[PDB]
Design an enzyme around this catalytic site. Structure first.
Site, mmCIF file in Angstrom:
data_model
loop_
_atom_site.group_PDB
_atom_site.id
_atom_site.type_symbol
_atom_site.label_atom_id
_atom_site.label_comp_id
_atom_site.label_asym_id
_atom_site.label_seq_id
_atom_site.Cartn_x
_atom_site.Cartn_y
_atom_site.Cartn_z
ATOM 1 C CG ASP C 70 -2.046 -0.971 1.135
ATOM 2 O OD1 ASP C 70 -2.700 -1.064 0.073
ATOM 3 O OD2 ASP C 70 -2.274 -1.668 2.145
ATOM 4 C CE1 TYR C 324 -10.391 -0.314 -0.470
ATOM 5 C CE2 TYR C 324 -9.586 1.921 -0.792
ATOM 6 C CZ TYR C 324 -9.589 0.742 -0.080
ATOM 7 O OH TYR C 324 -8.775 0.621 1.022
#
Ligand SMILES: *[C@@H]1O[C@H](CO)[C@@H](O[C@@H]2O[C@H](CO)[C@@H](O[C@@H]3O[C@H](CO[C@H]4O[C@H](CO[C@H]5O[C@H](CO)[C@@H](O)[C@H](O)[C@@H]5O)[C@@H](O)[C@H](O[C@H]5O[C@H](CO)[C@@H](O)[C@H](O)[C@@H]5O)[C@@H]4O)[C@@H](O)[C@H](O[C@H]4O[C@H](CO)[C@@H](O)[C@H](O)[C@@H]4O[C@H]4O[C@H](CO)[C@@H](O)[C@H](O)[C@@H]4O[C@H]4O[C@H](CO)[C@@H](O)[C@H](O)[C@@H]4O)[C@@H]3O)[C@H](O)[C@H]2NC(C)=O)[C@H](O)[C@H]1NC(C)=O
Ligand SMILES: *[C@@H]1O[C@H](CO)[C@@H](O[C@@H]2O[C@H](CO)[C@@H](O[C@@H]3O[C@H](CO[C@H]4O[C@H](CO[C@H]5O[C@H](CO)[C@@H](O)[C@H](O)[C@@H]5O)[C@@H](O)[C@H](O[C@H]5O[C@H](CO)[C@@H](O)[C@H](O)[C@@H]5O)[C@@H]4O)[C@@H](O)[C@H](O[C@H]4O[C@H](CO)[C@@H](O)[C@H](O)[C@@H]4O[C@H]4O[C@H](CO)[C@@H](O)[C@H](O)[C@@H]4O[C@H]4O[C@H](CO)[C@@H](O)[C@H](O)[C@@H]4O)[C@@H]3O)[C@H](O)[C@H]2NC(C)=O)[C@H](O)[C@H]1NC(C)=O
Ligand SMILES: *[C@@H]1O[C@H](CO)[C@@H](O[C@@H]2O[C@H](CO)[C@@H](O[C@@H]3O[C@H](CO[C@H]4O[C@H](CO[C@H]5O[C@H](CO)[C@@H](O)[C@H](O)[C@@H]5O)[C@@H](O)[C@H](O[C@H]5O[C@H](CO)[C@@H](O)[C@H](O)[C@@H]5O)[C@@H]4O)[C@@H](O)[C@H](O[C@H]4O[C@H](CO)[C@@H](O)[C@H](O)[C@@H]4O[C@H]4O[C@H](CO)[C@@H](O)[C@H](O)[C@@H]4O[C@H]4O[C@H](CO)[C@@H](O)[C@H](O)[C@@H]4O)[C@@H]3O)[C@H](O)[C@H]2NC(C)=O)[C@H](O)[C@H]1NC(C)=O
Ligand SMILES: *[C@@H]1O[C@H](CO)[C@@H](O[C@@H]2O[C@H](CO)[C@@H](O[C@@H]3O[C@H](CO[C@H]4O[C@H](CO[C@H]5O[C@H](CO)[C@@H](O)[C@H](O)[C@@H]5O)[C@@H](O)[C@H](O[C@H]5O[C@H](CO)[C@@H](O)[C@H](O)[C@@H]5O)[C@@H]4O)[C@@H](O)[C@H](O[C@H]4O[C@H](CO)[C@@H](O)[C@H](O)[C@@H]4O[C@H]4O[C@H](CO)[C@@H](O)[C@H](O)[C@@H]4O[C@H]4O[C@H](CO)[C@@H](O)[C@H](O)[C@@H]4O)[C@@H]3O)[C@H](O)[C@H]2NC(C)=O)[C@H](O)[C@H]1NC(C)=O
Ligand code: NAG
Ligand code: NAG
Ligand code: NAG
Ligand code: NAG
Ligand code: NAG
Ligand code: CA
Ligand code: CA
Ligand code: CA
Ligand code: CA
Lengths: 388, 388, 388, 388
Positions: C70, C324
């Site tokens: 990430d 997402y």
């Protein structure tokens, strides 16, 4: 916007400085660079750009095989940002064809492309990115034009065309365009005996074009155009400093009104700046092949059949391949004079380098300086072995 | 548009925040990214851009072989959008050459590129994307300039040049340009004994340049320029916090008017912000090689030969390669002060990583914050093994 | 230009129509497409664009190995033209970092990027493409923000941040920016017990954000912001139609003021449009993994703890990977109402598809229609086997 | 800006000149060129562009496998600069779907894309790059539209749609849009018995569309639209010069009000210019397959069931593959008449060339000249063997 008028003289040329170079063949070894040939440079009022005839394939593409050929349906005049290479992604298509010219008149740009088979070619004249006028072949033998920029005065943009034999008398016409429309055309007059691939520039005296005699001459024919009267004259550069290629060795007496003999049925596009004592001629260094490039200061070369160089500058070493060369200027630059500029096409591949199956080129370009600058030499820079 | 005037002081520097990073080498492993070196950053009134000297080949291209070399005919100053990498398709050529500087005066941008052989180099000065003035070599030994942005005040843009030895006394000149034209030049005066690769910034006090002494010094020479009077002074950063590379260990007394000795005939381009108690110096972490990068707050470093750090920030870990660094600011930003910024060149490849045959770099850039921000470290991020 | 005011209500949502889709992974199999994740969409007054966090490598590039991670120094917020893929050559870097938000206020765009190590991260706030303000970590545990667009009213642009644990109580703040400057910030108030990755939209009633409770909740927390008073409230969507992922099965009574239990320490960014009888919720079809996506019309979902769907639309089949999702609207469109829009990130690669070593995504986006349109389903469309 | 009005008649057509050609398949052999089909051309007031339906993959990409298929979620209407190829990096997405039309009204551009499964498709109407109106399927059988540009008059832009069988009676509607909004729609009236893929152009007489009868006809149906009254009529081209493909041989009596029989359940998109004695028809040279292309001057072809050619021009040799063809004009060009233009899709790959697994195309385009220009022929130019 207003039409540009040719109100200035040439700046004094004391040397040449680097203006642009795209390194297209080096970069195209590992990028999507279009195969081109017959490049030139031309300015808009707000930008100067590189131009060339694409072959409708990249260099690393398999369709690069066979690109020595001059005329196919896959060619187009493209332009791209100064000193960038001509890539698939940055090249703007001006028109479709295999012979071209282009110029900005101060308001908009005119581009002309010729396409078709040898016996049925036609020119399409574009203005402000739209087709406006068309001209059919008049001699049915490879209608063809400048391969470098045209020049405009008060909206009138003369262009030189030839249709007919490359190895005998042909039919050359000078066309006068305004906003893409044909105002007038004339047959060639004067003492030039064969005309191809004119390189032109403009200044207060008018428009001057240095062309190529493909038939018999190794001196260059010159066409001088009055864009107001829309008339012209022609002759040859009188100087014994011969500037075609291939060519004989330089004699001590040149020829003003006839081809200087020794080499037939060949030549290369070239250019000169003819401006009295401020005269400079471009030529390949080799007398045999398109290799090397030099500029020579030859006072009154146009009119003096005894004129010799008094200064020079090497642009490309004889060991390196050159090719076509031509004139352009930034007519919209600041100052009290027009700065003479030129480009040299640096041909790579066939026929001289036949281990590859393609023919392409890169571009180097110079403009004049009033300083006496040191000289470098400017090769294409690609290693042919990398393409094998 | 109006010429920019240097009317503000520096913002208070309490830490440094990330501004830009292009990850060029990572991306170039599998994209058409140009090989570069000697990068910098420079702002226009409406945009800030990355700059560098291209090598006229991509990294994955076979012509990347041999790019450790500094001066070839295939180099050019290019610019491209902030934090994008320098690609074949997004890079704009500013001029042709192997040493450069560039700056916007508020109306238009001036770019200067030097090209030529070692004994016959010349600078061409471009303004508003057109060539305007040319300067021939005066010492016939690698005419060379800043390799980062220049700075302008009311249209006057000073530039530092050096011509002559890199290992002995040389001929440094400060030129003052306006709209590309030479207003004036001066020979170097003051106590700096050798000058190369000046990194400059401007503020109400004038223009401050932190340079490199390649000959004898491991402290950095400083040139302070008044762009109105068009005069300058020179000395060294007095601080014993030494900022060249390679360099001796930090002593407790520095040198204001002579090179601090220990390392000869080497150095790296660097920078500082000299602003009394708001003074920050940049340097490589290593004293031996171009690795790591840190900023140190050293009050009155310019004038205090005993000055030591009171705060710092690591930018690049010592384990990671760095390189050239230089100053720039966004002179057109909103607010009451100029925010200090800098870039660090992150060199990959030769000579330090010789399993590849190329040399290139990526860029990281920071600007100051009035907050005391947490620090990260910013490596190039490429894995050399991927290129094998 | 004037600051945009939120003067309209939502258009009546009777179905969803295709708005954009970039097919990035399909195209990136054989093009220079950047590896991304955490995408969104945001409009300027004259253009709408795709946004995402680049990983600083292309998919086919060897540096794609390890991109499940990430937070690295090689990430940046990029934007690119609507429905084009994010390529090396068309992507514009907004700022550097690994967590972001961005929004246009009617005059200029604000973009915020957070970078740094876990214990020392910082946000840099950019306005009109220049850094303006910086915010240091306040809890020293992964300072992080929305990962979709913010919303502005009369120049005031609220943004939700969280710093602290992802698996326990954290420190959430709402910041109010104008022209990049901090007007005010507040600590989270209300009954939401954990806040991450808020998806926001604005309409005459104010600004509504639907977020994620990563700690204990499978219902979504909601923050309602008054951008004039610069105050907020928080709670959860009351509806038993649960919209986090992973999540328990839907009960018949939801929870308004506490997390609905069953799944801890996980979640996905999501969104809703809460507008009385015009309420629509987005969710993954699977209760276990990020697969499928559907919209459900759930009247008064925000306030009715018994509310159930009365209409729906499948966006992505359960057989296809999603990810997402977030809200955006074109605040500058013509008409009397704001048309609700959303995007779904379609994640490909790791951890679910581990035969490749990368993680990336493509984007699909829909907007509402007042018609009752037929539905299709919209997979990423890439075949993973092609990348092996 | 003002809405364009159709105030001019067609220019006299005496021959056709080359207008554009992208060589997309040649270039895509070694560049990131998107797989397309169903191309067209359309002008804005300041630029003319190529359009097509992308397949969401490049040609060399592995996802090119299977692109013979017409309708997938990975298709979109894209546009790109005139005569450039449709690349990943230069293509602008207009909307998402597998059937399209697009036109500029003088102020802004309307684009319409249809997507969805066969039984639940929907059109989304975009205006000035924003979605404005949506239309659901009315017959639940592949809602579909023109696949070339629409035409506007005083802001009103009519578009022809069909929903229903391709092999029997279907439900054709003419929609009238202004600024993307539906003013009115009508069911097809007149004697045309089946309508698909209308090619339209406008001139003072109104809007004329030449379509395809897929069901029973090898003559082409014609729809004539009054954009002021928002009414239409329909019939067939009366001429025995048949212009669908495949088709029977030319008889001596055509059919004005019914399909000319011989070939069922097939056809190709085509076009004509119907203008009394200035009438020209386009058709494939082959009666059996999509190969070759020619223009034929057939006086009063629309109304004269005995009409025969009096002049012609070959565009593509019968030996070379063609495909869809359609009309467009530069409504914003200078002069007193509209210059008729057309494009021909040059299909490469499947089903005719099945050694590759993809289907794509390139584009050639011509406009009329008042000169009688020599003719060339214009093949795609790619060598299929290179792709193996
Ligand atoms: C740093 O950079 C600077 C700037 O670039 C470098 O300085 C430059 O150096 C170059 C190379 O030397 C010079 O180019 C040559 O220029 C000469 C012309 O200048 C010379 O001759 C002038 C004329 O003299 C004659 O007339 C005058 C009139 O009064 C009279 O006084 C004199 O007695 C004589 O009668 C001189 O005025 C001039 O002197 C001046 O300049 C000197 C510096 O150059 C200076 O020292 C003096 O004090 C004074 O100020 C000078 O003597 C060109 O002739 C020459 O071009 C010929 O030679 C090259 C090969 O080098 C060739 O390629 C050319 O094509 C050409 O020769 C061919 O054509 C001729 C004409 O037909 C023919 O006669 C030749 O036989 C030859 O023909 C053969 O080859 C061709 C081509 O293949 C073929 O077609 C034929 O068939 C045949 O086979 C060069 O252009 C620059 O001018 C000079 N620039 C400056 C500003 O100084 C400097 O060197 C660099 N520094 C370092 C360290 O590298
Ligand atoms: C989250 O992020 C934040 C923000 O980034 C992190 O906080 C930062 O932490 C870093 C790392 O520690 C700090 O950088 C160092 O700063 C010190 C300077 O500050 C110290 O010293 C100050 C001066 O003290 C002296 O004078 C005062 C004047 O009155 C006097 O009071 C005092 O007694 C003494 O006489 C102190 O004021 C200061 O204290 C303050 O700040 C403290 C926090 O830092 C705080 O706790 C205190 O309460 C107070 O507020 C503090 O003590 C620099 O000296 C240092 O740089 C040296 O060291 C690094 C290696 O770490 C080296 O690379 C540098 O080059 C340098 O050392 C070389 O040069 C020296 C000068 O010649 C030389 O003396 C050294 O021997 C050494 O030389 C050798 O190496 C070099 C390089 O290779 C070579 O060239 C030489 O030849 C030789 O071989 C660091 O820059 C930040 O300032 C700090 N920022 C902030 C805002 O706090 C935080 O850590 C992060 N959090 C986490 C959890 O990670
Ligand atoms: C062409 O395109 C069109 C347009 O897209 C297509 O038409 C669409 O078809 C789809 C699919 O069927 C519809 O989506 C579903 O909608 C229903 C809601 O509508 C139904 O129920 C309404 C409410 O009825 C209740 O209340 C009313 C109030 O008075 C009462 O009257 C009634 O008796 C009952 O008490 C009805 O009003 C509605 O009827 C109307 O519409 C009909 C057409 O749909 C029409 O025929 C009628 O005449 C009337 O006009 C209709 O009956 C949603 O419930 C449904 O969503 C559930 O199911 C899907 C799976 O299909 C699932 O993924 C959803 O998550 C959800 O089910 C889960 O959640 C529930 C809530 O907690 C739970 O109860 C379920 O058990 C289930 O939970 C499980 O799965 C989830 C997810 O994994 C998990 O989280 C849980 O833990 C658990 O494991 C669909 O959204 C569209 O609305 C419809 N659109 C239109 C405009 O018609 C058309 O089909 C296409 N044509 C072709 C040929 O393909
Ligand atoms: C340099 O470039 C220039 C410019 O391009 C080239 O010049 C061009 O040359 C081409 C090729 O020849 C011409 O195209 C053909 O045009 C003819 C039409 O013109 C001819 O016929 C006219 C009509 O005559 C009839 O009516 C008049 C009315 O009074 C009457 O007087 C006359 O007696 C007769 O009754 C004549 O007016 C015309 O003469 C004029 O022009 C002459 C030059 O062309 C000139 O010399 C004369 O002096 C005078 O000025 C001329 O005779 C088209 O008919 C023809 O199209 C047919 O043939 C091609 C094959 O070549 C075919 O593909 C077409 O589809 C079509 O034939 C099919 O359809 C017919 C209609 O149904 C059918 O009858 C045929 O049997 C055939 O059908 C079969 O094939 C099709 C297709 O596969 C299939 O569907 C059917 O089922 C069936 O199987 C060409 O279009 C250009 O017009 C001409 N341009 C100019 C400006 O001159 C020049 O050649 C180039 N130079 C060089 C050296 O290369
Ligand atoms: C060039 O001359 C023409 C004719 O006098 C004049 O109308 C035009 O404005 C001039 N162009 C410029 C740039 O002044
Ligand atoms: C800078 O100062 C000069 C000289 O007073 C002035 O003319 C110019 O307008 C100033 N520039 C700006 C941006 O105000
Ligand atoms: C929004 O409201 C403010 C405050 O009244 C006003 O000044 C501004 O002009 C408005 N914006 C627009 C687009 O009208
Ligand atoms: C077209 O006609 C309308 C209606 O009369 C007029 O308002 C409009 O200005 C016209 N468009 C142009 C380009 O003149
Ligand atoms: C294309 O896909 C088919 C499956 O439909 C497969 O059999 C064929 O080998 C594929 N072609 C290539 C070049 O992989
Ligand atoms: Ca010759
Ligand atoms: Ca040194
Ligand atoms: Ca959760
Ligand atoms: Ca048919």
């Amino acid at each position: 916007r207003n039409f540009n008028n040719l109100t200035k003289g040439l700046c004094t040329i004391n040397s040449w400085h680097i203006y642009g170079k795209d390194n297209a063949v080096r970069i195209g070894e590992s990028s999507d660079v279009l195969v081109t040939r017959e490049p030139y440079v031309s300015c808009d009022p707000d930008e100067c750009r590189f131009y060339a005839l694409s072959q409708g394939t990249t260099i690393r593409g398999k369709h690069s095989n066979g690109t020595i050929h001059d005329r196919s349906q896959y060619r187009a005049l493209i332009s791209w940002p100064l000193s960038s290479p001509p890539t698939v992604y940055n090249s703007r298509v001006e028109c479709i064809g295999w012979s071209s010219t282009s110029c900005h008149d101060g308001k908009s740009r005119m581009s002309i492309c010729i396409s078709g088979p040898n016996n049925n070619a036609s020119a399409v004249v574009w203005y402000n990115r739209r087709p406006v006028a068309e001209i059919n072949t008049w001699a049915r033998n490879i209608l063809r034009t400048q391969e470098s920029e045209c020049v405009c005065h008060n909206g009138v943009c003369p262009v030189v065309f030839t249709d007919g034999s490359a190895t005998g008398p042909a039919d050359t016409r000078i066309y006068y365009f305004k906003e893409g429309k044909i105002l007038k055309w004339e047959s060639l007059t004067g003492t030039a005996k064969h005309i191809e691939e004119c390189s032109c520039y403009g200044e207060r005296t008018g428009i001057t074009c240095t062309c190529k005699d493909n038939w018999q001459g190794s001196n260059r024919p010159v066409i001088q155009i009055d864009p107001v009267a829309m008339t012209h004259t022609s002759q040859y550069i009188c100087s014994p400093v011969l500037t075609d290629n291939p060519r004989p060795n330089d004699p001590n007496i040149g020829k003003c009104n006839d081809p200087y003999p020794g080499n037939n049925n060949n030549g290369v596009k070239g250019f000169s700046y003819l401006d009295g004592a401020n005269t400079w001629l471009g030529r390949t260094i080799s007398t045999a092949s398109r290799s090397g490039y030099e500029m020579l200061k030859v006072p009154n070369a146009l009119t003096d059949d005894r004129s010799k160089p008094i200064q020079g500058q090497t642009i490309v070493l004889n060991a390196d391949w050159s090719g076509y060369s031509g004139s352009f200027m930034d007519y919209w630059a600041e100052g009290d004079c027009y700065r003479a500029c030129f480009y040299v096409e640096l041909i790579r591949g066939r026929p001289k380098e036949d281990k590859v199956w393609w023919t392409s080129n890169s571009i180097v370009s110079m403009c004049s300086s009033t300083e006496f600058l040191g000289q470098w030499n400017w090769p294409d820079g690609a290693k042919i072995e990398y393409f094998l």
